[PDB]
């Protein structure tokens, strides 16, 4: 079939740089940064336990609840018990915040609490101070807002107003209450805060309260539980959680588990490899997960991420709420947390605890080996399952804090980093979420590890983070992670993708940051980039060049280091790189290297002149982006040498003159954006301030690549994608068109006198081009380009090509005719420009790319299969532009004084033919050397060859017709004409059809002869015919007279 031909055709000017506008992605407002770091410098422990005496308010039962801080006061005497309980509570709090000035109070008086709290506030005026109160041995707080403590003789409970309590305290403080009606305490505290606010007109959010109960509720009196329950949940969550689990009906599933066995559990809270440490780690992960999923982001950051002690207190407060809900008790906190007792992660906590302590009897008795709990592995499996179809921005995964927790240890660190990288690959929103959870400090600390397997995952994660948020450069420089990145970049064995990842990271670090630039200079980044400059990887070279450019941006020491290393000479090689992106990056780097001369010795002037003359040969460049970067580099040159450029400009109203000529060339650029930038740069020179400096968005546009996902399969490879189905339908339509055309041609050619339509144009139809498949004909006028249809018969579009009055659209072509077609329009001065969306309903005319070619009119011959483009005209040179590399590949010499009137080529062979004004028809073979490119030169005409077109068949027959009108069919293997014909004495225009041998000619007397290769008379249509065009597939012909009328003819 004819489908394989369409599929294996490169799509010229169809890439990211052509479709997407070259601009930087706007940086989002990254609020993941922690505003301030509070510290609990001191903790106050007020324990009004009243050991040995029961409060009158509550009549305790005979067994009662005698356990305070896991200590039985009645066994060891009153004073000794109180001291031991105070010490044990200090130890339990030190378990969470070891570095704090703990000052215990054992049954204190009002003045004693006054002195304690005032001294602590004087010690820490602006840092958090924890106040811990135990009202188990004193009467309940009253509605009036008072707290009961002891007098000197311990004969009566003297009250203590909460107003005075918070007057002695300060605004930065957290309060933990363990009383019966602690809700009354919280309500009175808030009422006093409101009273203070009312008085202030003529410390509410800052102070945090944790309360054991609501105002109405009473503490539980069950003998099994400790009397000190809320503090046991807050300070020793794992022990109380296991004790509470061993009291539920879930124990029935696991026989042989008792509180006596829990008392003898092995391991410590710190060693995560031990069962107790594993349980503590799992509890931390689950509580953090519940807090993250339930609480809002702002409250989660304020509570569970500000400081260690408050975060731990609230993580244990979740467990306190869950435990005390079952005893008709509701803990109260100053910021009202939404209820978390029903969260689904508590079931996972129960299952994990069950699995962990189901092995406990064997550990205790048989002394077996403790197998690690599969909790984290299963949670990471769930995270992976979410990521499998997590492309859509659905509800965020519940396992992000679990990923953060499992990042801490090394047992599953590599898998956690892999999953985190896969998640950050999803997009900027995923990176923002991960930074909001608080992975940044831990990923930053991970850079200290010397494990070589972590390097790819870490560089991937850091590249994503820096692509999203660029403010991390200061933190990376502070922690010396740039040393880690330099070590990554200096390993040839590393895969190239991670090396370009690290190159991007280093480019972002040094981006407009003098500290980072100096740090990387002292890290020998220049040499590292230079050694990896000629690497066979386009993106690696591009980002190495960008990093080199950003290193010496306003940095004279970096420029000196580059000069010593001959960085400019080595960077000159990238200016000829086939990839346009690398050329643009090299131009950016060279311009930035120029822009920081700062008046050094004559060697600096010489090297600036050398770089300028090396960049001044890059004007003849296909890529408008690279030319814009060249304009920016030349603007840097101008800023460096403003006085010399002013003198040069005033001279005409020898190095700077050449740069001025280059800028003038760039000013009259076909691409509007390059022309505008060059014009602005030139105007900045005449009136001679810093505001004239303009920076292009190429660097940020390149950095946008790392924001987009990379791992997932591209949309083109998707077989069931809509785009591929549309392309398949288009190719099916093209195959049908070709088959129908071949069937029509097989039936012969009858007389063609059918006039499909007759219209009027605003301008003279100069060149008419048929779209091969869709029913669109592109007619170019002097100052416009119309697109008519021969089915609907309506004017679709009316462009302005942009060429000046003297110029004229001479040649035209349809790039990518099979699908997603472009329109190439070459003016007679050299300007070649490509149009997109030229016949669309919901899209406006669009200019893809443009570049001044060369520098009869201008003749163009597109070659879709090889991707090359040959332009010719008045010059004695035939240029061969390659749209893939966007650079001129060959310039074969015409070797004749007359202009190239026509140009055509044979597919699958190098048989570039060219009609000439003098009459000769030269043929060129680009396989051989330039001096041997010329193959044959036969001169049997003296007139402008109207069209020396060629036949696509293997037996190519150059049908060359001059103004004299004498047809001479030539062959590439015979130096003499095979067939000679004479048609019209005065000929004006003609066209040839490759499939059907139909030579359509013009005439001054309105005649239009459509003859055959044999010269047989077929049709003499009676109406200067200056534009004829044949449909490449159908036997259609377009006739446009000197009058602005267009017609399309067909055979029945």
């Amino acid at each position: 079939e004819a489908d394989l031909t369409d599929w294996n055709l490169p799509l010229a000017f169809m890439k990211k740089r052509h479709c997407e506008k070259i601009e930087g992605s706007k940086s989002l407002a990254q609020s993941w940064r922690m505003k301030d770091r509070m510290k609990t410098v001191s903790v106050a422990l007020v324990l009004c336990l009243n050991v040995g005496v029961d409060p009158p308010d509550v009549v305790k039962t005979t067994p009662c609840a005698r356990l305070e801080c896991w200590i039985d006061p009645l066994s060891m005497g009153p004073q000794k018990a109180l001291e031991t309980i105070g010490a044990n509570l200090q130890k339990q709090y030190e378990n969470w915040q070891p570095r704090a000035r703990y000052k215990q109070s054992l049954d204190p008086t009002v003045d004693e609490v006054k002195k304690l709290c005032t001294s602590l506030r004087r010690n820490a005026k602006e840092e958090r101070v924890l106040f811990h109160y135990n009202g188990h041995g004193v009467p309940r707080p009253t509605v009036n807002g008072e707290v009961w403590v002891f007098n000197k003789n311990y004969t009566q409970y003297i009250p203590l107003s909460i107003y005075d309590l918070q007057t002695w305290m300060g605004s930065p403080s957290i309060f933990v209450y363990d009383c019966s009606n602690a809700g009354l305490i919280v309500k009175s505290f808030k009422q006093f805060a409101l009273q203070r606010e009312q008085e202030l007109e003529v410390s509410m959010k800052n102070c945090i309260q944790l309360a054991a109960c609501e105002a109405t509720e009473l503490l539980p009196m069950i003998p099994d539980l400790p009397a000190d329950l809320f503090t046991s949940c807050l300070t020793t969550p794992i022990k109380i959680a296991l004790r509470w689990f061993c009291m539920q009906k879930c124990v029935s599933l696991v026989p042989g588990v008792t509180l006596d066995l829990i008392e003898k559990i092995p391991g410590r809270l710190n060693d995560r490899r031990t069962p107790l440490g594993e349980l503590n780690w799992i509890f931390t992960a689950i509580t953090d997960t519940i807090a993250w999923n339930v609480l809002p982001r702002d409250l989660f950051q304020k509570l569970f991420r500000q400081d260690l002690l408050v975060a731990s207190l609230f993580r244990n407060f979740l467990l306190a709420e869950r435990i005390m809900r079952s005893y008709n008790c509701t803990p109260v906190s100053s910021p009202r947390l939404p209820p978390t007792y029903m969260h689904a992660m508590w079931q996972a906590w129960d299952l994990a605890v069950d699995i962990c302590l189901s092995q406990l009897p064997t550990i205790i008795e048989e002394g077996t080996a403790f197998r690690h709990s599969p909790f984290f592995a299963e949670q990471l499996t769930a995270f992976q399952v979410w990521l499998t179809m997590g492309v859509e921005n659905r509800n965020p995964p519940e396992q992000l804090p679990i990923v953060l927790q499992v990042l801490l240890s090394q047992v599953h660190r590599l898998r956690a980093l892999d999953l985190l990288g896969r998640f950050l690959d999803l997009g900027p929103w995923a990176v923002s979420l991960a930074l909001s959870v608080g992975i940044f400090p831990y990923v930053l600390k991970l850079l200290q590890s010397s494990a070589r397997e972590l390097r790819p995952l870490l560089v991937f994660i850091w590249a994503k983070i820096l692509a999203v948020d660029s403010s991390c450069q200061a933190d990376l420089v502070k922690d010396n992670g740039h040393k880690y990145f330099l070590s990554v970049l200096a390993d040839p064995y590393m895969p190239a993708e991670h090396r370009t990842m690290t190159a991007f990271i280093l480019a972002v670090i040094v981006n407009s940051y003098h500290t980072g630039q100096e740090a990387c200079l002292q890290g020998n980044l220049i040499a590292i980039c230079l050694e990896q400059l000629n690497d066979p990887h386009p993106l690696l070279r591009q980002w190495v060049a960008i990093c080199l450019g950003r290193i010496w941006q306003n940095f004279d020491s970096a420029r000196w280091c580059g000069v010593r290393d001959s960085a400019h000479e080595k960077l000159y090689s990238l200016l000829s790189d086939p990839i346009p992106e690398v050329r643009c990056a090299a131009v950016f780097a060279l311009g930035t290297f120029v822009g920081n001369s700062a008046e050094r010795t004559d060697h600096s002037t010489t090297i600036d002149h050398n770089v300028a003359m090396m960049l001044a040969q890059l004007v003849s460049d296909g890529s408008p982006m690279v030319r814009k970067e060249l304009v920016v580099a030349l603007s840097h040159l101008v800023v460096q040498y403003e006085s010399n450029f002013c003198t040069v400009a005033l001279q005409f109203i020898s190095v700077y003159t050449q740069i001025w000529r280059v800028l003038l060339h760039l000013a009259a650029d076909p691409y509007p954006e390059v022309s505008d930038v060059a014009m602005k740069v030139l105007n900045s020179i005449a009136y001679k301030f810093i505001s004239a400096t303009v920076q292009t968005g190429f660097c940020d546009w390149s950095a946008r690549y790392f924001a987009q996902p990379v791992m997932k399969i591209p949309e083109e490879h998707d077989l069931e994608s809509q785009i591929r189905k549309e392309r398949e339908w288009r190719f099916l339509r093209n195959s049908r068109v070709r088959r129908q055309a071949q069937q029509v041609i097989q039936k012969g050619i009858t007389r063609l006198d059918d006039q499909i339509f007759l219209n009027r144009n605003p301008g003279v139809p100069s060149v008419v081009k048929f779209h091969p498949f869709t029913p669109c004909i592109a007619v170019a006028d002097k100052d416009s380009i119309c697109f008519w249809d021969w089915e609907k018969g309506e004017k679709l579009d009316y462009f302005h090509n942009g060429n000046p009055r003297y110029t004229r659209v001479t040649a035209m072509e349809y790039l990518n005719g099979q699908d997603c077609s472009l329109l190439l329009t070459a003016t007679d001065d050299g300007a070649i420009r490509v149009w997109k969306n030229f016949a669309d309903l919901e899209k406006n005319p669009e200019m893809v790319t443009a570049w001044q070619g060369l520098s009869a009119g201008m003749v163009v011959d597109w070659e879709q299969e090889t991707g090359l483009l040959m332009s010719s005209g008045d010059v004695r040179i035939v240029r061969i532009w390659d749209t893939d590399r966007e650079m001129k590949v060959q310039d074969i010499p015409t070797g004749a004084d007359s202009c190239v009137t026509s140009l055509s080529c044979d597919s699958h062979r190098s048989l570039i033919v060219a009609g000439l004004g003098d009459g000769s028809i030269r043929v060129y073979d680009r396989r051989m050397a330039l001096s041997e490119c010329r193959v044959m030169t036969y001169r049997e005409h003296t007139a402008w060859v109207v069209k020396a077109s060629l036949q696509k068949r293997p037996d190519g027959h150059i049908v060359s017709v001059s103004v004299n009108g004498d047809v001479r069919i030539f062959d590439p293997r015979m130096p003499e004409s095979v067939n000679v014909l004479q048609i019209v004495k005065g000929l004006t225009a003609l066209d040839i059809h490759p499939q059907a041998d139909l030579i359509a000619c013009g005439s001054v007397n309105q005649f239009t002869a459509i003859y055959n290769s044999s010269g047989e008379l077929i049709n003499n249509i009676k109406y200067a015919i200056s534009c004829l065009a044949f449909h490449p597939h159908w036997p259609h012909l377009a006739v446009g007279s000197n009058d602005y009328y267009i017609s399309v003819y067909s055979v029945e």
Binding site: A311, L408, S409, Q410, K445, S449, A451
Partner: peptide, 9 residues
């Protein structure tokens, strides 16, 4: 830091 990253070299 809120948590304790261990085994970091």
């Amino acid at each position: 830091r809120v948590f304790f990253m261990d085994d970091v070299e």
